[PDB]
Coordinates of C-alpha atoms and ligand atoms in Angstrom, one line a residue:
Chain Z
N197 CA 111.0 59.6 146.6
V198 CA 110.7 63.4 145.9
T199 CA 108.7 66.1 147.5
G200 CA 106.3 68.8 146.4
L201 CA 107.8 71.5 148.4
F202 CA 109.5 74.1 146.3
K203 CA 108.3 72.6 143.1
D204 CA 109.7 74.8 140.1
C205 CA 106.5 75.7 138.3
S206 CA 108.2 77.6 135.6
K207 CA 107.4 76.9 131.9
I208 CA 111.1 77.0 131.2
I209 CA 112.4 73.9 129.4
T210 CA 115.9 73.8 130.6
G211 CA 117.8 73.4 133.9
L212 CA 119.7 75.8 136.2
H213 CA 123.4 76.0 135.7
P214 CA 125.1 74.2 138.5
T215 CA 125.8 77.6 139.9
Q216 CA 122.3 79.0 139.7
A217 CA 120.7 75.8 140.8
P218 CA 119.5 75.4 144.3
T219 CA 119.5 71.7 144.2
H220 CA 121.1 68.8 142.5
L221 CA 117.7 67.8 141.0
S222 CA 117.2 71.2 139.4
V223 CA 120.5 71.1 137.5
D224 CA 120.0 70.5 133.7
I225 CA 120.8 67.0 132.6
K226 CA 123.4 68.6 130.2
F227 CA 125.7 69.1 133.2
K228 CA 125.0 65.7 134.9
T229 CA 127.4 62.7 134.7
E230 CA 128.0 59.6 136.9
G231 CA 125.9 61.1 139.7
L232 CA 127.6 64.5 139.8
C233 CA 127.4 67.8 138.1
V234 CA 130.1 69.3 135.9
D235 CA 130.9 72.9 134.8
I236 CA 130.5 73.0 131.1
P237 CA 131.6 76.6 130.2
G238 CA 130.3 76.1 126.7
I239 CA 126.8 75.9 128.2
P240 CA 127.0 79.3 130.1
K241 CA 124.8 80.3 133.0
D242 CA 121.6 82.2 132.4
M243 CA 121.9 86.0 132.6
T244 CA 118.4 86.4 133.6
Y245 CA 115.5 84.3 134.7
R246 CA 112.3 84.0 136.8
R247 CA 111.1 80.7 138.1
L248 CA 107.9 80.4 140.2
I249 CA 108.5 78.3 143.3
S250 CA 105.6 76.4 144.9
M251 CA 105.3 76.9 148.7
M252 CA 102.9 74.0 149.0
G253 CA 104.2 71.0 150.9
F254 CA 105.3 72.4 154.2
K255 CA 105.9 69.8 156.9
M256 CA 106.4 71.2 160.3
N257 CA 107.6 68.2 162.3
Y258 CA 110.6 69.9 163.9
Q259 CA 111.5 69.2 167.4
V260 CA 114.0 71.8 168.2
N261 CA 115.2 72.4 171.8
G262 CA 113.9 76.0 172.4
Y263 CA 111.1 76.2 169.8
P264 CA 107.3 75.7 170.3
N265 CA 105.5 73.3 168.2
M266 CA 102.8 75.0 165.9
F267 CA 100.5 72.1 165.8
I268 CA 98.9 71.2 169.1
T269 CA 97.0 68.3 170.7
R270 CA 93.2 68.3 170.9
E271 CA 93.7 68.7 174.7
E272 CA 95.6 71.9 174.3
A273 CA 93.1 73.3 171.8
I274 CA 90.3 72.8 174.3
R275 CA 92.5 74.1 177.2
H276 CA 92.9 77.3 175.0
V277 CA 89.6 78.1 173.3
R278 CA 89.1 81.9 173.3
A279 CA 92.4 81.9 171.3
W280 CA 90.6 79.8 168.7
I281 CA 90.1 81.6 165.5
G282 CA 88.8 79.9 162.3
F283 CA 90.9 80.0 159.1
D284 CA 90.2 79.2 155.5
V285 CA 91.8 80.4 152.4
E286 CA 90.5 80.4 148.9
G287 CA 93.2 80.4 146.3
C288 CA 93.8 80.8 142.6
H289 CA 96.1 79.1 140.1
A290 CA 99.3 80.2 138.6
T291 CA 98.9 80.4 134.9
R292 CA 100.8 82.3 132.1
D293 CA 104.5 82.4 132.9
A294 CA 104.1 79.3 135.1
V295 CA 101.7 76.7 136.3
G296 CA 101.5 74.1 139.0
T297 CA 100.9 75.9 142.3
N298 CA 98.3 77.9 144.2
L299 CA 98.4 81.5 145.4
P300 CA 96.2 83.0 148.3
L301 CA 93.3 85.1 147.1
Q302 CA 90.7 85.4 149.8
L303 CA 91.5 84.8 153.4
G304 CA 88.6 84.1 155.7
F305 CA 88.4 84.2 159.5
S306 CA 85.8 83.1 162.1
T307 CA 85.3 86.8 162.7
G308 CA 83.3 88.0 159.9
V309 CA 86.5 89.1 158.0
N310 CA 87.5 88.4 154.4
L311 CA 90.8 89.9 153.2
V312 CA 91.4 89.9 149.4
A313 CA 95.0 89.6 148.4
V314 CA 96.9 90.3 145.2
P315 CA 97.9 86.9 143.8
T316 CA 101.6 87.1 144.7
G317 CA 104.2 84.3 144.8
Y318 CA 107.8 83.4 145.2
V319 CA 110.0 83.7 142.2
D320 CA 113.5 82.5 142.2
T321 CA 115.8 84.8 140.0
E322 CA 119.5 84.8 139.2
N323 CA 120.3 87.1 142.1
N324 CA 117.7 86.4 144.8
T325 CA 114.2 85.2 145.5
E326 CA 111.6 87.8 144.7
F327 CA 108.1 88.1 146.2
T328 CA 106.0 89.5 143.5
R329 CA 102.7 89.5 141.6
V330 CA 102.1 86.3 139.7
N331 CA 99.6 85.7 136.9
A332 CA 96.8 83.7 138.1
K333 CA 93.2 82.6 137.5
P334 CA 90.3 81.4 139.6
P335 CA 89.7 77.6 139.7
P336 CA 87.9 76.1 136.6
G337 CA 84.5 75.4 138.1
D338 CA 81.2 77.3 138.1
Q339 CA 81.0 77.6 141.9
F340 CA 84.3 79.5 141.7
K341 CA 83.0 82.3 139.4
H342 CA 82.4 84.4 142.5
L343 CA 86.2 84.7 142.7
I344 CA 86.5 86.3 139.3
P345 CA 85.8 89.9 140.6
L346 CA 88.3 89.3 143.3
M347 CA 91.2 88.9 140.8
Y348 CA 90.9 92.7 140.4
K349 CA 90.1 94.6 143.6
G350 CA 92.0 93.2 146.5
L351 CA 95.3 94.5 147.9
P352 CA 99.1 94.3 148.6
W353 CA 100.5 91.7 151.0
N354 CA 102.3 94.8 152.6
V355 CA 98.8 95.5 153.9
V356 CA 97.0 92.2 154.2
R357 CA 99.4 91.0 156.9
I358 CA 99.1 94.2 158.9
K359 CA 95.3 93.9 158.7
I360 CA 95.5 90.3 159.9
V361 CA 97.6 91.3 162.9
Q362 CA 95.3 94.1 163.7
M363 CA 92.2 91.9 163.2
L364 CA 93.5 89.2 165.5
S365 CA 94.8 91.7 168.0
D366 CA 91.5 93.4 168.4
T367 CA 89.6 90.1 168.7
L368 CA 92.0 88.3 171.1
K369 CA 93.5 91.0 173.2
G370 CA 91.2 90.5 176.2
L371 CA 90.7 86.7 175.7
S372 CA 94.0 85.0 175.3
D373 CA 97.8 85.4 175.0
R374 CA 97.9 83.4 171.8
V375 CA 96.2 82.4 168.7
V376 CA 95.0 78.9 167.5
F377 CA 94.1 78.7 164.0
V378 CA 91.3 76.3 163.6
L379 CA 91.7 74.5 160.2
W380 CA 89.8 71.9 158.2
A381 CA 92.4 70.7 155.7
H382 CA 95.6 72.4 156.8
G383 CA 97.6 72.2 153.6
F384 CA 96.8 75.5 151.8
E385 CA 96.2 77.5 154.9
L386 CA 99.7 76.5 156.3
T387 CA 101.1 77.6 152.9
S388 CA 99.2 81.0 153.3
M389 CA 100.7 81.4 156.8
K390 CA 104.2 81.6 155.1
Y391 CA 103.0 85.0 153.8
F392 CA 102.4 86.4 157.4
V393 CA 103.9 84.1 160.1
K394 CA 107.4 84.1 161.4
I395 CA 108.5 81.6 164.1
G396 CA 111.0 81.2 166.7
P397 CA 111.7 80.5 170.4
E398 CA 109.2 82.1 172.7
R399 CA 109.7 85.9 173.3
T400 CA 108.0 88.6 175.3
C401 CA 106.5 91.9 174.3
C402 CA 108.4 95.2 174.4
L403 CA 107.0 97.3 177.2
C404 CA 104.6 94.5 178.4
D405 CA 105.7 91.2 179.8
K406 CA 103.0 89.1 178.2
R407 CA 104.0 86.5 175.6
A408 CA 105.0 87.9 172.2
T409 CA 102.2 87.1 169.7
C410 CA 103.5 89.6 167.0
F411 CA 106.7 90.6 165.3
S412 CA 107.9 93.7 163.6
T413 CA 110.2 93.3 160.7
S414 CA 110.3 97.1 160.4
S415 CA 112.2 97.3 163.7
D416 CA 113.3 93.8 165.0
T417 CA 110.9 93.9 168.0
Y418 CA 108.1 91.9 169.5
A419 CA 104.5 92.4 170.9
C420 CA 101.5 91.0 172.8
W421 CA 98.1 91.4 171.5
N422 CA 97.6 94.9 173.2
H423 CA 100.7 96.6 171.9
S424 CA 100.9 95.0 168.4
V425 CA 100.1 98.1 166.5
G426 CA 101.9 98.7 163.3
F427 CA 103.3 95.2 163.7
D428 CA 103.2 93.2 160.5
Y429 CA 103.7 89.6 161.4
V430 CA 102.0 87.0 163.6
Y431 CA 104.7 85.4 165.7
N432 CA 104.1 82.1 167.3
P433 CA 100.8 80.8 166.3
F434 CA 99.2 77.5 167.1
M435 CA 96.9 75.5 165.0
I436 CA 94.8 72.5 164.9
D437 CA 93.6 70.5 162.1
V438 CA 90.0 69.5 162.9
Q439 CA 89.4 67.0 160.0
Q440 CA 92.4 64.9 161.4
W441 CA 90.4 64.1 164.5
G442 CA 88.3 61.6 162.7
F443 CA 85.5 62.8 160.3
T444 CA 83.2 61.3 157.7
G445 CA 82.4 63.5 154.7
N446 CA 83.3 67.1 154.0
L447 CA 83.1 70.2 156.2
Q448 CA 79.6 71.1 155.0
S449 CA 78.4 67.7 156.0
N450 CA 79.7 67.4 159.5
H451 CA 78.9 70.9 160.3
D452 CA 75.3 70.9 159.2
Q453 CA 74.7 67.7 161.2
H454 CA 75.1 69.8 164.3
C455 CA 74.0 73.4 163.3
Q456 CA 71.3 75.3 161.5
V457 CA 72.4 78.9 161.7
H458 CA 75.7 79.3 160.0
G459 CA 74.6 79.2 156.4
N460 CA 77.3 78.3 153.9
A461 CA 77.9 80.8 151.2
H462 CA 80.8 79.6 149.1
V463 CA 82.9 82.4 150.7
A464 CA 86.1 81.8 152.7
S465 CA 85.0 83.1 156.1
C466 CA 81.9 80.9 156.1
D467 CA 84.1 77.9 155.8
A468 CA 86.2 79.4 158.7
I469 CA 83.2 80.0 160.8
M470 CA 81.8 76.5 160.2
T471 CA 85.1 74.9 160.9
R472 CA 85.3 76.6 164.4
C473 CA 81.6 75.8 165.0
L474 CA 82.1 72.1 164.4
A475 CA 85.2 72.0 166.7
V476 CA 83.2 73.6 169.5
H477 CA 80.4 71.1 169.1
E478 CA 82.9 68.2 169.4
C479 CA 84.3 69.6 172.6
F480 CA 81.7 71.6 174.4
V481 CA 78.3 70.3 173.2
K482 CA 79.8 66.8 173.9
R483 CA 79.2 67.6 177.6
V484 CA 81.2 69.6 180.1
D485 CA 84.6 68.6 181.3
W486 CA 85.0 70.0 184.9
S487 CA 88.7 68.9 185.0
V488 CA 89.5 71.6 182.5
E489 CA 89.8 75.0 184.1
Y490 CA 90.1 78.4 182.5
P491 CA 91.9 81.4 184.1
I492 CA 90.3 84.7 185.0
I493 CA 90.3 87.2 182.2
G494 CA 88.2 89.7 184.1
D495 CA 85.4 90.2 186.5
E496 CA 84.4 86.6 187.0
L497 CA 84.8 86.4 190.7
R498 CA 82.2 89.1 191.4
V499 CA 79.7 87.5 189.1
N500 CA 80.2 84.1 190.6
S501 CA 79.7 85.1 194.2
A502 CA 76.6 87.1 193.2
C503 CA 75.2 84.1 191.4
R504 CA 75.7 81.9 194.5
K505 CA 74.4 84.5 197.0
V506 CA 71.2 84.8 194.9
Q507 CA 70.9 81.1 194.3
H508 CA 71.0 80.5 198.0
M509 CA 68.5 83.3 198.9
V510 CA 66.0 82.2 196.3
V511 CA 66.1 78.5 196.9
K512 CA 66.2 79.0 200.7
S513 CA 63.1 81.2 200.6
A514 CA 61.0 79.1 198.2
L515 CA 61.5 76.1 200.4
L516 CA 60.3 78.1 203.4
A517 CA 57.6 79.8 201.5
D518 CA 55.9 76.9 199.9
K519 CA 57.3 74.1 202.2
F520 CA 58.2 71.8 199.3
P521 CA 58.8 68.1 200.5
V522 CA 61.2 67.4 197.7
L523 CA 63.8 69.4 195.7
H524 CA 64.7 67.9 192.3
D525 CA 68.2 69.5 191.6
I526 CA 68.4 69.0 187.9
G527 CA 71.9 69.9 186.4
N528 CA 74.1 69.2 189.4
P529 CA 77.1 66.9 188.5
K530 CA 78.3 67.2 192.1
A531 CA 76.5 66.5 195.3
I532 CA 76.6 70.1 196.5
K533 CA 73.5 71.7 198.0
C534 CA 73.1 75.5 197.6
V535 CA 71.0 75.4 200.8
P536 CA 72.9 72.7 202.8
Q537 CA 70.9 73.3 206.0
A538 CA 67.4 72.7 204.7
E539 CA 65.0 70.0 205.8
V540 CA 63.6 69.1 202.3
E541 CA 64.6 65.8 200.6
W542 CA 67.3 66.8 198.1
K543 CA 67.6 64.6 195.0
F544 CA 70.3 65.2 192.4
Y545 CA 70.2 64.6 188.7
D546 CA 72.6 65.2 185.8
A547 CA 73.7 63.9 182.3
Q548 CA 77.4 63.8 183.7
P549 CA 76.9 62.4 187.2
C550 CA 80.5 62.9 188.5
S551 CA 82.1 59.5 189.0
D552 CA 83.6 60.7 192.3
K553 CA 80.4 60.3 194.3
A554 CA 78.3 58.7 191.5
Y555 CA 75.8 57.1 193.9
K556 CA 74.1 60.4 194.8
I557 CA 73.1 61.3 191.3
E558 CA 70.5 59.9 189.0
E559 CA 71.8 59.9 185.5
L560 CA 69.3 62.0 183.5
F561 CA 69.0 64.2 180.4
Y562 CA 65.9 66.3 180.9
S563 CA 63.5 66.8 178.0
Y564 CA 60.0 68.3 178.3
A565 CA 58.8 65.9 175.7
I566 CA 59.7 63.1 178.0
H567 CA 59.7 64.3 181.6
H568 CA 56.9 66.9 181.7
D569 CA 54.8 64.7 183.9
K570 CA 57.5 63.0 185.9
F571 CA 58.6 65.6 188.5
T572 CA 55.2 66.4 190.0
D573 CA 56.2 66.2 193.6
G574 CA 57.8 69.2 195.2
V575 CA 59.9 71.6 193.1
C576 CA 62.5 71.4 190.4
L577 CA 65.7 73.4 190.4
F578 CA 67.3 74.4 187.1
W579 CA 70.1 76.8 187.9
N580 CA 72.0 77.2 184.6
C581 CA 70.7 73.9 183.3
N582 CA 69.4 74.8 180.0
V583 CA 66.6 72.7 178.6
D584 CA 63.6 72.6 176.3
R585 CA 60.4 74.1 177.8
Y586 CA 60.6 74.2 181.7
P587 CA 58.0 72.5 184.0
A588 CA 55.7 74.8 185.9
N589 CA 57.0 73.8 189.4
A590 CA 60.5 75.2 188.8
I591 CA 63.1 77.6 190.0
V592 CA 65.1 78.7 187.0
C593 CA 68.3 80.7 186.2
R594 CA 69.2 81.1 182.5
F595 CA 72.1 82.9 180.8
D596 CA 71.1 85.2 178.0
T597 CA 73.4 84.3 175.1
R598 CA 72.9 87.6 173.5
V599 CA 74.9 89.4 176.1
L600 CA 78.3 90.3 175.0
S601 CA 81.4 90.0 177.1
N602 CA 84.9 88.4 177.2
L603 CA 83.4 85.4 178.7
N604 CA 80.7 84.8 176.2
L605 CA 82.1 83.4 172.9
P606 CA 80.3 82.2 169.8
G607 CA 79.1 78.6 169.5
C608 CA 76.6 76.2 167.9
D609 CA 73.2 76.8 166.4
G610 CA 72.6 80.2 167.8
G611 CA 74.0 79.6 171.2
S612 CA 77.3 80.3 172.8
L613 CA 80.2 79.1 174.9
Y614 CA 80.1 80.9 178.2
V615 CA 83.6 80.4 179.6
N616 CA 83.8 81.6 183.1
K617 CA 85.7 79.2 185.2
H618 CA 85.1 76.0 183.3
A619 CA 83.4 76.1 179.8
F620 CA 79.7 75.9 179.5
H621 CA 77.9 75.5 176.2
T622 CA 74.6 77.4 176.6
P623 CA 71.8 77.0 174.0
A624 CA 70.3 80.2 172.7
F625 CA 67.9 82.1 174.9
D626 CA 64.3 81.0 173.8
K627 CA 61.5 83.1 175.4
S628 CA 59.0 80.2 175.0
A629 CA 60.8 77.9 177.4
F630 CA 59.4 80.0 180.2
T631 CA 55.7 79.6 179.3
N632 CA 55.0 77.8 182.5
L633 CA 56.8 80.3 184.7
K634 CA 56.8 83.8 186.2
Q635 CA 59.6 86.2 186.0
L636 CA 61.0 86.3 189.7
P637 CA 60.6 89.8 191.3
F638 CA 63.3 91.2 193.6
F639 CA 63.1 90.4 197.3
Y640 CA 65.3 89.9 200.3
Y641 CA 64.5 87.6 203.1
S642 CA 66.2 87.0 206.5
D643 CA 65.0 85.4 209.6
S644 CA 68.4 85.9 211.3
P645 CA 68.9 87.8 214.6
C646 CA 69.1 91.6 214.5
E647 CA 71.7 94.4 215.5
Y648 CA 75.4 107.4 207.6
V649 CA 71.6 107.5 206.5
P650 CA 69.3 104.3 206.6
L651 CA 66.6 103.1 204.0
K652 CA 63.2 101.7 204.0
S653 CA 62.0 99.3 201.3
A654 CA 59.0 97.1 200.8
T655 CA 61.2 94.3 199.3
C656 CA 63.1 93.8 202.5
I657 CA 61.3 90.9 204.1
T658 CA 62.6 90.9 207.5
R659 CA 61.3 90.7 211.0
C660 CA 62.4 94.3 211.5
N661 CA 60.4 96.1 208.8
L662 CA 56.9 96.2 210.1
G663 CA 57.4 99.9 210.1
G664 CA 60.8 101.5 210.9
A665 CA 63.5 99.1 211.8
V666 CA 66.3 99.8 209.4
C667 CA 68.1 97.2 211.6
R668 CA 71.7 98.2 210.9
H669 CA 72.9 94.6 210.4
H670 CA 70.2 93.5 208.0
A671 CA 70.2 96.9 206.3
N672 CA 73.7 96.1 205.1
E673 CA 73.0 92.5 204.3
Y674 CA 70.0 93.8 202.2
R675 CA 72.0 96.4 200.4
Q676 CA 74.8 93.8 199.6
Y677 CA 72.3 91.3 198.3
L678 CA 70.7 94.1 196.2
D679 CA 74.1 94.7 194.6
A680 CA 74.7 91.0 194.0
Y681 CA 71.2 90.7 192.5
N682 CA 71.8 93.6 190.1
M683 CA 75.2 92.3 189.2
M684 CA 73.9 89.1 187.9
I685 CA 70.9 90.7 186.1
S686 CA 73.2 93.0 184.2
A687 CA 75.7 90.2 183.8
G688 CA 73.0 88.6 181.5
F689 CA 71.2 86.1 183.8
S690 CA 67.5 85.8 183.9
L691 CA 65.4 84.5 186.8
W692 CA 62.0 82.7 186.6
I693 CA 60.0 80.8 189.2
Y694 CA 56.7 78.9 189.6
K695 CA 53.7 81.3 189.4
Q696 CA 52.5 80.5 193.0
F697 CA 55.6 82.1 194.5
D698 CA 54.4 84.7 196.9
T699 CA 56.3 86.9 199.3
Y700 CA 53.5 86.8 201.8
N701 CA 54.5 83.2 202.5
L702 CA 57.7 84.8 203.8
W703 CA 56.0 87.7 205.5
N704 CA 53.8 85.2 207.2
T705 CA 56.8 83.8 209.1
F706 CA 56.8 87.2 210.9
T707 CA 53.1 87.9 211.1
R708 CA 52.7 85.2 213.7
Chain B
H217 CA 100.0 68.7 138.4
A218 CA 102.8 70.2 136.5
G219 CA 106.2 71.4 137.5
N220 CA 109.5 69.6 137.5
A221 CA 110.2 69.2 141.4
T222 CA 113.2 70.3 143.3
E223 CA 113.7 68.7 146.7
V224 CA 114.0 65.5 148.6
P225 CA 111.9 64.4 151.7
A226 CA 114.8 64.8 154.0
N227 CA 115.1 68.4 153.6
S228 CA 111.4 68.9 153.7
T229 CA 111.3 69.4 157.5
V230 CA 114.6 71.3 157.9
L231 CA 113.6 73.8 155.2
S232 CA 110.0 74.4 156.4
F233 CA 111.5 75.4 159.8
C234 CA 114.1 77.8 158.3
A235 CA 111.6 79.3 155.8
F236 CA 109.2 80.3 158.6
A237 CA 112.0 81.4 161.0
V238 CA 112.7 85.0 162.1
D239 CA 116.4 84.2 162.1
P240 CA 117.1 81.3 159.6
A241 CA 120.7 81.1 160.4
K242 CA 120.0 80.7 164.1
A243 CA 117.3 78.2 163.3
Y244 CA 119.4 76.0 161.2
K245 CA 122.2 75.9 163.7
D246 CA 119.8 75.1 166.5
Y247 CA 118.1 72.5 164.3
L248 CA 121.4 70.6 163.9
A249 CA 122.2 70.9 167.6
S250 CA 118.8 69.3 168.1
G251 CA 120.0 66.3 166.1
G252 CA 118.6 67.2 162.7
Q253 CA 120.4 66.1 159.6
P254 CA 122.0 68.9 157.5
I255 CA 120.6 70.0 154.2
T256 CA 121.5 67.5 151.5
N257 CA 120.7 67.3 147.7
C258 CA 123.4 69.9 146.8
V259 CA 125.3 70.5 143.6
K260 CA 128.5 68.5 144.0
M261 CA 131.0 69.0 141.2
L262 CA 133.1 66.5 139.2
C263 CA 136.4 68.3 139.3
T264 CA 140.1 67.8 138.5
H265 CA 140.9 68.8 142.1
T266 CA 143.9 70.9 141.0
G267 CA 142.5 74.4 141.3
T268 CA 143.3 77.4 143.5
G269 CA 142.3 77.1 147.1
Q270 CA 140.0 80.2 146.9
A271 CA 136.5 79.9 148.4
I272 CA 134.3 81.7 145.9
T273 CA 135.4 81.2 142.4
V274 CA 134.1 81.6 138.8
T275 CA 134.6 77.9 137.9
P276 CA 135.4 74.8 140.1
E277 CA 138.8 75.1 141.9
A278 CA 139.0 72.3 144.4
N279 CA 142.1 70.8 146.1
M280 CA 142.6 67.2 147.1
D281 CA 141.6 68.7 150.5
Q282 CA 138.3 70.2 149.2
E283 CA 135.2 69.6 147.2
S284 CA 133.6 72.0 144.8
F285 CA 129.9 72.9 145.0
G286 CA 127.3 74.8 143.0
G287 CA 127.2 78.0 145.2
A288 CA 123.4 78.7 145.2
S289 CA 122.9 75.1 146.6
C290 CA 125.2 76.0 149.5
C291 CA 123.2 79.0 150.4
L292 CA 120.6 78.6 153.1
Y293 CA 118.7 81.6 151.8
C294 CA 118.6 80.2 148.3
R295 CA 117.5 76.8 149.6
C296 CA 114.7 78.3 151.6
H297 CA 113.7 80.8 148.9
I298 CA 113.7 83.6 151.4
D299 CA 115.4 87.0 151.7
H300 CA 119.1 87.5 152.0
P301 CA 120.7 89.5 154.8
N302 CA 122.8 91.4 152.2
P303 CA 121.2 94.8 152.5
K304 CA 121.2 95.1 148.8
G305 CA 120.1 91.6 148.8
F306 CA 122.0 89.9 145.9
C307 CA 123.4 86.5 146.9
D308 CA 127.2 86.4 147.0
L309 CA 127.1 82.7 146.2
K310 CA 124.7 82.4 143.3
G311 CA 126.2 82.1 139.9
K312 CA 129.6 81.0 141.4
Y313 CA 131.3 77.8 142.7
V314 CA 132.1 77.2 146.4
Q315 CA 135.1 75.4 147.7
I316 CA 134.4 73.3 150.9
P317 CA 137.0 71.2 152.9
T318 CA 136.2 67.5 152.4
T319 CA 136.3 67.2 156.2
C320 CA 133.5 69.8 156.5
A321 CA 131.7 69.0 153.2
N322 CA 129.3 66.8 155.2
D323 CA 127.3 70.1 155.7
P324 CA 127.8 72.5 152.8
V325 CA 125.1 74.9 153.8
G326 CA 126.1 75.2 157.3
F327 CA 129.7 75.5 156.4
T328 CA 129.0 78.7 154.4
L329 CA 126.9 80.2 157.2
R330 CA 129.4 79.5 159.9
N331 CA 132.5 80.6 158.0
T332 CA 133.8 83.8 156.4
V333 CA 136.0 84.7 153.4
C334 CA 139.2 86.7 153.6
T335 CA 139.0 89.9 151.6
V336 CA 142.7 89.7 150.8
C337 CA 143.4 86.1 149.6
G338 CA 139.8 85.0 148.8
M339 CA 140.2 81.9 150.9
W340 CA 138.2 80.9 154.0
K341 CA 139.5 82.2 157.2
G342 CA 140.7 79.2 159.2
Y343 CA 140.3 77.0 156.2
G344 CA 143.2 77.9 154.1
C345 CA 144.4 81.3 155.0
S346 CA 148.1 82.3 154.9
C347 CA 147.7 85.7 156.6
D348 CA 148.9 86.5 160.2
Ligands
ZN215 ZN1 77.6 76.7 162.9
ZN216 ZN1 121.7 82.7 148.4
ZN217 ZN1 144.2 86.3 153.7

């Protein structure tokens, strides 16, 4: 039929002289005959005019050979969290000189940021199209009266777009090489992007080699997130419309079903935050996908080897110390033993029992409410398997969500998405889950064979420590373990263990 | 909602792409090479077809060989409601009529991007120039 894109919102009651008209449909009926237009010199062209043009109605379906597609699949959105940034814009209505289109007023991001803009819009004139201030008003309702003060204050689009580039740059420069705007109803937000997004074939950053994420109109050049300073436009963005996945009611509804922290003020950024929150829940709270792998953005390899070295020492030692008959490995989707050479019966449990070797894992979602009396025999292992209250007979490792890093991103409730290798949604650290446990003190244990300045320590439990044996081999191994242990402590991980754990059970293997 | 509309869902995609592009000219050309259909809904003139061959004229001046169009509608930058590359920035085709070879009048907008006007005779180089 006819589109809404570029709707002339002007209160003018005539047409646009065949010469000043941009389209056939915009020409005044006074020059239209038998399907064509005709130059009637007695009806002269307009010397001057100003017609507000609606920029609502963009459709970005293009499939052009060298150009990236702005909208992405749910798969890519997940593949590239980090890059996710929530985006919601509150507008205002065109009103005196024109009417029938919305202008950006408050731009909200899933950072805490709210940028207020001068209501500007696109005006077609007799010579060119001008980008200028447009008369506007906040939407009619009562819940929109908070936008009345914002019709004053605010600032120039000159600025607002630089601020956006800067804001995104700071947020994303150590996380991704792109940006993915996370949208609820993409219409108006895509319109707002016209005001600060340019697109084209992929490019790379001046100086750097990374992907260009920004563009300077000032001097036709491109930038990554680390060099984009003074750059005014976002260059190739990506975006995802969350509601299009398949949702019931409004944003407020679906979000609050899965979250009690992000309170909704009527302000733009809250809707942005909530939008992201919801998307995270539908991809990361809906349990872990181990086939999706994420790249190293920094110092992950050192944390992971520390985590395993410690995991091994602690579980190895507790099994020798208290001679448990059974080890209940809760939270292991694979069939991998952290102490593969132990005599104990090793049972595996998980909510996502990997299909490839499904037979070795009992499907289970642990709840204290349910299983508090079920795993009585032996010891339970919860190494980054975050539950409700933990059972007294347990060895536990839990990530403190409050620790900031490039790996720890915001998530549901009060928790977070720890994205090391693979993405792990971790529920907020709750002190009372460890009621039944003891915080695990530092120790080192080795029953291995033995071999500028040496050190003595009481925490080194080794056959060569009964008074002077800095045993060069196990001096090193101790000092390395010590570093690994401290790595993971300061990396945010917390260790707890059954109260009966006693290092004399370990010393006793040597006092004999 | 008010307003008196402007465009046809045909141009809706083509235009969104060039509006957002860094280089609209390049974008449009690439778009067409990628199989997209050229911008339509232009201002085509009912004309005697007896006028001077000149490209940019005050009133319609088509030949039997040409068609006459309402200049602004043949200008990519006017159709996208974006900035013009004229450093001063006033469109050279708005408020005038544009003469386009019937053989090339399939794509008015592209035709004006792709071609150039002779400063001496006022006719398109290659499409009606008597110099050289
Ligand atoms: Zn939330
Ligand atoms: Zn133009
Ligand atoms: Zn000539």
